Write a protein that binds this ligand. Sequence first.
Ligand SMILES: [Zn+2]
Lengths: 149, 99, 50, 76, 50, 209, 199, 54
Amino acid sequence: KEDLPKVVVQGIPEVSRAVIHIDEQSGKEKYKLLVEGDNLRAVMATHGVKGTRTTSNNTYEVEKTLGIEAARTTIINEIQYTMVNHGMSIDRRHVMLLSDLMTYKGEVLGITRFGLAKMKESVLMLASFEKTADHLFDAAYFGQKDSVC
Amino acid sequence: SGSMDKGTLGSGSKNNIFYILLRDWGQNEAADAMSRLARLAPVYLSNRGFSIGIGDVTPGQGLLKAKYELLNAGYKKCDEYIEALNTGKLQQQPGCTAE
Amino acid sequence: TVAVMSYSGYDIEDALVLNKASLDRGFGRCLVYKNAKCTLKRYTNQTFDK
Amino acid sequence: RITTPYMTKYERARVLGTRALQIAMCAPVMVELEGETDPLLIAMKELKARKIPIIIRRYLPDGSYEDWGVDELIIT
Amino acid sequence: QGRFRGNLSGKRVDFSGRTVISPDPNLRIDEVAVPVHVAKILTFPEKVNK
Amino acid sequence: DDEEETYRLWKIRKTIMQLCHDRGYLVTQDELDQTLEEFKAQSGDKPSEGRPRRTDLTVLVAHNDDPTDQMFVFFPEEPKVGIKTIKVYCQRMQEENITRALIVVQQGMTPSAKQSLVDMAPKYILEQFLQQELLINITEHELVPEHVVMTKEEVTELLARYKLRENQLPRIQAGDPVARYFGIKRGQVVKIIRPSETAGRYITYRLVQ
Amino acid sequence: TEFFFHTMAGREGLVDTAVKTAETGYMQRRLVKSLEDLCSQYDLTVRSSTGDIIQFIYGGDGLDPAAMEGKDEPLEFKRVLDNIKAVFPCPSEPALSKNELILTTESIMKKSEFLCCQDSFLQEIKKFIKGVSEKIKKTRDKYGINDNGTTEPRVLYQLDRITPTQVEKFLETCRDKYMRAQMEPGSAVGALCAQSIGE
Amino acid sequence: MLLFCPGCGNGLIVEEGQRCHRFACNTCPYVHNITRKVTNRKYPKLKEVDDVLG
Ligand SMILES: [Zn+2]
């Protein structure tokens, strides 16, 4: 009685809420699905959904589902849309360079200390940014020679 | 033709006259034009006079009448909506509740 | 006696233009008082600051 | 010969700085200055007259290099 | 306030000043007015040449 | 059922045909352009259709490289594939002397079966594919650009033009969906054609690592 | 009550700005610390400090965002053409027809100095030339202007007046602007991107 | 529903005896055999048919 009504009978378990958005273009009013879920593969695999034109906001799901280039394109589009929402414009070359830096090792790596450590190699910069003592002791243990490039 | 404003002399976006001078004739010409503007505009603005007073912000009689009519109409429509929601059924907009 | 107007372009952003004759006759004249304190204390030994 | 023939602003700044530092250290002048006590003004005059005896050594990332004269490059 | 952030990446230097600003439209956009008092303190090393 | 299941099977078969055509294998135009009516003519019901055997494909040969090279596509009927099914598929490929095979699972692969498939044999190359991923073609997606695997001559020309090394090129994981779609190995290079906002295109390159 | 509500709104704005200052400061610090290593090399390839390439060409084309005259475009061909017509009005040269304009454009574009230019910019120039030639043709068809140059009302030639001198000036100006708008090697593109995203 | 023993007031569970299903308490020999049908509906809220926006 505590969990029998809470069983899924139809739909994607990761999908929490889907709504029918409509575009009222003068030529034609078309219908699309706005899904507040975290499963892009399941949405594309469902019947009646044109998976060729399905996007998402979560860059990790796009990376895992449609490749690293689709993730880069999603990052670019999402950053540009978020910037335009506030009325301020940024040249596309900057966001393209940012997405390329985030997606040049084959995996979307963030700007946090973990992604910065996975991308960069210089010990001095890793120590100066965050986790000074830990990085310094790890470098002393590994004996990693750091250049001045 | 036309009158100068922020759309043409301000730092908003492109189509600025100083931007056109910078992109067409170099930096020195744009700097000289900006210096001439900054030395000319204050002189004329002081010799002509530009002031704001309490009379520049006071409302007119027609404005007061229009404001009164609009306030009355808006309050009547808001009271009608309140009465419709509290007593009876109110047309619920899509994607949201009645409140 | 403030007059709200633009004058000489030296009051572009929040600035104000003051009158020389007004400041010369005592308008805005201010006084700053500072304190300088010194101590001549007797130590444990029978000697003192002089 | 494959790089841009235009002389970049960074090259301009570095060449002017080196020339001003040299002239400040009793270097010979090749433009016959007329009452210019500032070495940077003399360096700019030499750059405009294209008489700076400095050759830029542009290095490619792999390791290759190429030499470009100041008079050979294009200034703006 | 560590060595990297407070003494390596960003550190204090000499031959510098800090002053309140005031408008002056009679100067070019690439020019800035310096007080005589600060100019007498901030010095520039010029090498004696011909 | 019996309506969505056959549609999923037809779409998976069409996606497999498109993948084989993109990889360079020999597929006729009829197999690439196969309507749902022809699939119903082959089999119109779920019990009539045979997932393990009626859908298997063995005519897949690399006509561009060598007709002797053969590739096989499997469709296990059970949702989770065990060790025994993998062993049966491997011994069947040994009987038919096939080195490259694909496994289209229905729900997933057990971790033991995954680990075994990883280290089956260097000569026996088998790739795991979920039916959920194969319901939509990754190449036809608007976000996914055009990827073309470059030959060794083109990679040499690139490295000579840019005076680069292999490790200096941008990396792309082997587990990438596009990488598994094309079946590219470590050391190969893929040229990517990004469609720009204007009429031009941006050419980039990525090394599998 | 209205004054109290206005003070509430003002305090909400103040606390919003107070939080935004610190949040964007931290974001800017992170972005700059991450992006400060990239630099534009001389081979038009953006590489990191270790030598790994991030982009084979910056922005796909290689143009300076600071020198971007149009809306993410290098030049606004209409404004450049109008400026060329206004600065150099040649009254002693006859107007050009559609065929003559296309011919002189194809003759000038095939020179050596235009070979090193990118193909996309040349295609855009050709598209703009074809568009303006179609406009001139439509005007001459509307007003019956003859390409021989013997029409009695000469003011009709002032509607869409173009001379080969103006064509050459426009093409040379566009080529020079495109050459001077490219990324100068050695620029710290990563720091500029970090700042232009954080601000 | 929630039922309690009249004897001690503890919660009653449903078990199976030798003849029929019965309510029983875990701290006293009190039992109660079920004679007729007993039901406890809850009437869960129906997933309101959402409307299209835009
Ligand atoms: Zn009891």
